[PDB]
Amino acid sequence: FEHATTVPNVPGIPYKALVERAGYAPLNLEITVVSSELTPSTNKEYVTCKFHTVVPSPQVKCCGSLECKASSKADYTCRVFGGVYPFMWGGAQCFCDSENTQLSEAYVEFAPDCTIDHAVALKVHTAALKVGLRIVYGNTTARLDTFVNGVTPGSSRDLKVIAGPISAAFSPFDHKVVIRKGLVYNYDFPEYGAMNPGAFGDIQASSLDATDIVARTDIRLLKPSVKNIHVPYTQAVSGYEMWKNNSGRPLQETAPFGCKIEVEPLRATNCAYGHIPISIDIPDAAFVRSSESPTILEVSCTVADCIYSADFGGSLTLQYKANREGHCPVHSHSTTAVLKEATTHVTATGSITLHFSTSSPQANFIVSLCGKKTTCNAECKPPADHIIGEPHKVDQEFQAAVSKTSWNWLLALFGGASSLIVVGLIVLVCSSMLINT
Amino acid sequence: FEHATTVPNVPGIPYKALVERAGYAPLNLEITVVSSELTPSTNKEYVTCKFHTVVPSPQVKCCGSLECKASSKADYTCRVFGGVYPFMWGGAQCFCDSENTQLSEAYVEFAPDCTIDHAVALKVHTAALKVGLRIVYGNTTARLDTFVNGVTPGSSRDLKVIAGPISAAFSPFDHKVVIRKGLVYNYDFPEYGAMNPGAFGDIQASSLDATDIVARTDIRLLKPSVKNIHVPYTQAVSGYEMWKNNSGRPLQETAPFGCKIEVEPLRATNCAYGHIPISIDIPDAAFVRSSESPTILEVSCTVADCIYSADFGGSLTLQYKANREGHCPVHSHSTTAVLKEATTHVTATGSITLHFSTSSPQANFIVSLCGKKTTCNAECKPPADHIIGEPHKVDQEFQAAVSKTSWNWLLALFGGASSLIVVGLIVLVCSSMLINT
Lengths: 437, 437
Ligand SMILES: *[C@@H]1O[C@H](CO)[C@@H](O)[C@H](O)[C@H]1NC(C)=O
Ligand SMILES: *[C@@H]1O[C@H](CO)[C@@H](O)[C@H](O)[C@H]1NC(C)=O
Known about the structure:
This is part of a larger assembly, with two copies of chain A.
Chain A (H helix, E strand, L loop, with lengths): L1 E7 L3 E8 L7 E22 L10 E4 L14 E6 L4 E2 L2 E2 L7 E7 L12 E19 L2 E8 L12 E4 L12 E5 L2 E3 L17 E3 L7 E3 L3 E3 L11 E3 L3 H7 L14 E3 L4 E3 L5 E7 L14 E8 L10 E9 L3 E7 L5 E2 L3 E4 L4 E7 L4 E8 L5 E5 L18 H4 L2 H33 L1
Antiparallel strand pairs in A: 1-20, 2-3, 3-9, 4-8, 5-8, 6-7, 9-10, 9-12, 11-20, 12-13, 14-15, 16-17, 18-19, 21-22, 22-26, 23-25, 23-27, 24-26, 27-28
């Protein structure tokens, strides 16, 4: 039978359900979420690194003109100087004194170590969740990896599964992210061509081995004043290094919902946000006939000094009388109560002891011992341990959160006040009726 | 000087503009969009083609039983068959009389011709637009490939131009696009792992040469009733061929505003939608000092043979008695009328005949004949032909479509009705004044 069921998408915390057809015995569906990868659609938009800003040797022409042409090479600052006099070791460098032209040109290039120290800037638009489920039914165990997109099955040969649309869309990455050496940043980098000097992406290329490199690093060229030849340039500081100085915090540290971010590809593992509805097609071979199943006749339950916590600190004792031997599954239909064992053994009119975990101060729930119903209504104390090392397995509800005695005095007080108003109105009605006569 | 102007996005249709600055004189401006590529970002969801449904050699063996194992081949289908007894040419293929076993097997691989006859599935996310721009100012022509996404300089060597956001971003592509053989289609394909029998995406892969392929076409294998060895299988029709039968028309013939769509890369060039803000900073050398500009003592205007249309059919004649010589720019300050020319060689005293287009019957406009203003009135005749080969030049406003006679008669009727209302209230007021006495 196809059984739709809502499961929290937290890693760990095994979730339990009971499947049942009216002509068949109940079976213990066991569904556990192991992994949850949020791999979004990521496309590379540029790559940047610290520039090498290498300057070529200057050109000299002497008693003439040396006007330079435009170039198709990154950040080509070209300027000519008149009235110069280059002088290397040995003597002067041309033959005129005053009428001279020095062609000083400068460009930038990727540093030799940009193969590693490089930040790639991408856009992230839509994230889809892949979830691994371990499901055991009728002591048959299957692990399978599926999607949450709502229309995709997985290992359908053993068990047919659909994981529908998740209740909440997280998308921890924003629209526009930066990747550096395994660290993720939500940086609003400038687009391709918005070439601000001194900030991130001051030099960008399409790929790491590419000649399509653009840079607007502000290189101001100065006319030399010394007797020797050199090219004096003053350049804006590397915006890659300035961004690295005040990048902020990576998403291995600031990811909500406990996400752990991995690179190559970009993904967010072990995220616990919302709930997922999944429809499970239980195969008919796993169904066991109710005639073969040992039926139960009398059931009763009295818990003994439970606790409510993330730990499995409560225990039922179940009194019963049945007709035959065999193991049957036990499940609680209340959202407050989840048990420990998905099945137990019932032989003949004895006793059994089971464990559970709850969150309400009142332990009011229903137990399906070998099927049917068994209502347990009791009370137990809050825990003494302040902090626990495992997540809470039960979501709180306002109806269950308020304790039973608290409902008792609140209901009695509100009923008393309302009774005062009712008796006052009744006295008014009776008094008006008598004074009318 | 920053001169922000709004230019129609329509390709071709050169845009006149005027740059006036105090002391730096009027100057012509020529803004033309030559090409407008709209390149989005796409991610390859999967590839698909015709499958091959290869049936391997059968595994028959005798006086025994066979049990297959799961394989990683796409759409792996076992069936073990008892009681088989195969024949080839020569006789029985095995010893054992009746109790036998044969493992009938079938899986799915690519066709040999998937290298060309394949369809890729892409998720078009968001399209940014790029304009090749041709700007002519004074006697200087420049071409620059600018980005339209926001602040991005173009040809920064001589003329920094910033193209703002588009007025209304219209995407010809839907969120899902299938490309086959250079033809694009807006097909909502099933996602990865959402295979269906007899439908598109029945076989999916990351690439054509990839081995991690998967398919869910309904192959079922039947018991071989014939005496000879044979593997009978019935399989659902190829969803690729079924989609090819009824794919519908491609987007090269259904795209709004008429881009030409071409692939590698996926792009849609030269639609015509909306308006674009462009801020241009003209270099200071191009401005002429206002002293050398030959100004007019006084202008005049007249029209001849007006035909309001998409063509430059209207003709006007202007009289001048300028004080000096030389060429100087002329421009029309009309949102509903644009001139043909951009400059005129004014010479002392004489007459200039020029051409213009307009989309209003009452062609009244203000033009600047090489300075100041010139008011022109024309009662412009309707066009003769019904269909014109080249597009329009101005957009029609509500006040422009109404001719002078229409304003006269309509305003006369509303004025008459309002006059009756006013005189009625006046007569009521004075009648109340007389009866108050
Ligand atoms: C940049 O790095 C220097 C190096 O010492 C550091 O002092 C400074 O705080 C960093 N940040 C800024 C914003 O200057
Ligand atoms: C499919 O192909 C057949 C083959 O003749 C053709 O008649 C039919 O129009 C095509 N389309 C549909 C939607 O059946």
